[PDB]
């Protein structure tokens, strides 16, 4: 069966980092698919998304990675992300 707990936004945005590279490279890709798995379970919000600048991670890590199921959860949770930061200028 398939296990999972929620966890705060910050402690996902931590995964994330000790599952990439400084440079946003893959190098535990097990970890950072249940990061995106994650976050499109436990949506985070406008300030905290901010803070975390997890909008900025997930898609540079969304160009680094060759996974395409990676890159396209991620595009699904970038788009999700548009509507929850509502700019209206750069």
């Known amino acids: 069966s398939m296990t999972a707990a ?5 402690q996902i945005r931590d995964r ?26 436990y949506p985070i919000t406008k300030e905290a998304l901010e803070e975390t600048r997890l909008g900025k991670l997930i898609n540079d890590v969304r160009k680094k990675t060759k996974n395409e199921e990676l890159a396209k959860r991620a595009k699904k949770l970038l788009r999700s992300w548009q509507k929850l930061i509502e700019p209206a200028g750069s």
């Not at 929620?6 to 910050?10: F, R």
């Not at 400084?22 to 379970?41: C, D, G, T, Y």
Request: hydrophobic share 45%.
């Open 6 to 10: 929620p966890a705060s936004p910050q």
């Open 16 to 41: 994330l980092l000790q599952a990439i590279d400084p440079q946003s490279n893959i190098r535990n890709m097990v970890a950072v698919l249940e990061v995106i798995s994650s976050l499109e379970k």
